[PDB]
């Protein structure tokens, strides 16, 4: 169960940075979640029903499908809000990235704490572009939407080339795999961090 990593890059306006990230997070969390498990004393469990809803973008000419959980929506918009703040107060660099990590929880003997083994991680690298005129805005909307289409398609086409997923747990260890804190969904144990990057140069090799 070694780690699987993937990278995405999108060039967006500063206004579009939140919508672009939410579209990537929600589509990945859509596939990386299930209905809430209700356990019986015997050990059987029933799986709840996951809802879906469309979200139309305001700063982008794009629409994406997210799970109807409102707690997950607010939770994601908060951390992407922290990203949107940090990048503005980082100024001229403007090169940031978020990472969505899906991890299992493994029990450790005393005194050690439980070790969180990652099994899949998603990195999205943001490139912010400054704008001037309005007719450049109305085109940036379209082209950014059409890029996000390619991105979502690629994500879906990856969610199949990845055969491995952690085994379904029993009633005791259900929190070693799933985030059972939301009342509307049961997503896999995930951790969302971000990082502002210093731009690096390009070597003169095959060029």
């Amino acid at each position: 169960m070694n780690c699987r990593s993937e990278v995405l890059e999108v060039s967006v306006e500063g206004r579009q940075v939140e919508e672009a990230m939410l579209a990537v997070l929600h589509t990945v969390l859509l596939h990386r979640s299930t209905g809430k498990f209700h356990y019986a004393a015997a050990g059987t469990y029933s799986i709840g029903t996951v809802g879906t809803q469309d979200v139309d973008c305001d700063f982008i000419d794009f629409t994406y499908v997210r799970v109807s959980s409102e707690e997950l929506d607010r939770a994601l918009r908060k951390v992407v809000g922290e990203f949107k703040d940090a990048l503005r107060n980082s100024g001229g660099d403007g090169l940031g990235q978020m990472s969505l990590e899906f991890y299992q929880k493994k029990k450790s003997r005393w005194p050690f704490s439980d070790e969180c083994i990652p099994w899949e991680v998603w990195t999205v690298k943001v490139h912010v572009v400054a704008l001037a005129t309005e007719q450049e805005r109305q085109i940036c909307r379209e082209k950014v939407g059409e890029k996000l289409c390619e991105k979502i398609i690629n994500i879906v086409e990856v969610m199949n080339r990845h055969e491995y997923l952690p085994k379904m747990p029993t009633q005791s260890e259900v929190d070693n795999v799933f985030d059972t804190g939301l009342r509307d969904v049961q997503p896999y144990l995930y951790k969302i961090s971000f990082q502002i990057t210093d731009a690096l140069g390009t070597s003169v090799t095959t060029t």
């Binding site: 596939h31 299930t34 209905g35 709840g48 879906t52 000419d61 969610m159 969904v185």
Partner: protein, 182 residues
């Protein structure tokens, strides 16, 4: 065996829900379904996809009580009619079943869950094809037709591209769901 009878249930209702997701994605407005922790015995694949009876009827008449198999694939054709009457095949969603089977699966519930994820991938992909941005601003009118093929895409014009929404292996063969759009 009862196992493959349940498998036939899963393939059948997966096909019906496929038609539902596609046609509802070409319906011209946003779709919104609420989740439930106390679900009903009708929430197939743990997904709230409200069946609209007219398209279940059309889909069943197209299936004629059969399932996809080798050489027999289900297709959903999304087309456009304008004021002049020009008909264009915009999308052909194809639900293929190939020959390669896989015995390493307990068809019990792995196929069910992976088919659920395939329906989620279909939900996401149906909103990133250009015919979605077309069908939301609808002037224009969108038409659908389900048919059992024998799939062919000559009506798409030269230069079409295909997006693969995904595959799911079963002991009777692997399912493929893709789209050929203009």
């Amino acid at each position: 065996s009862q196992d493959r009878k349940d498998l036939d249930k899963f393939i059948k209702f997966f096909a019906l829900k496929t038609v539902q997701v596609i046609v509802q994605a070409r319906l011209g407005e946003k779709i919104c379904t609420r989740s439930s922790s106390s679900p009903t015995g009708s929430d197939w694949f743990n997904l709230a996809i409200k069946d609209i009876p007219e398209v279940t009827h059309e889909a069943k008449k197209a299936l004629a009580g059969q399932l996809p198999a080798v050489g027999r694939s289900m297709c959903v054709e999304i087309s456009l009619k304008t004021s002049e009457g020009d008909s264009m095949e915009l999308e052909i969603w194809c639900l293929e079943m190939n020959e390669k089977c896989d015995k390493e699966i307990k068809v019990s519930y792995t196929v069910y869950n992976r088919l659920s994820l395939l329906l989620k991938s279909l939900l996401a992909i149906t909103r990133v094809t250009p015919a979605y941005r077309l069908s939301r601003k609808q002037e224009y009118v969108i038409l659908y037709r389900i048919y059992f093929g024998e799939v062919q895409l000559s009506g798409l014009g030269e230069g079409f591209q295909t997006v693969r929404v995904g595959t799911v292996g079963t002991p009777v063969g692997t399912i493929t769901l893709s789209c050929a759009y203009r």
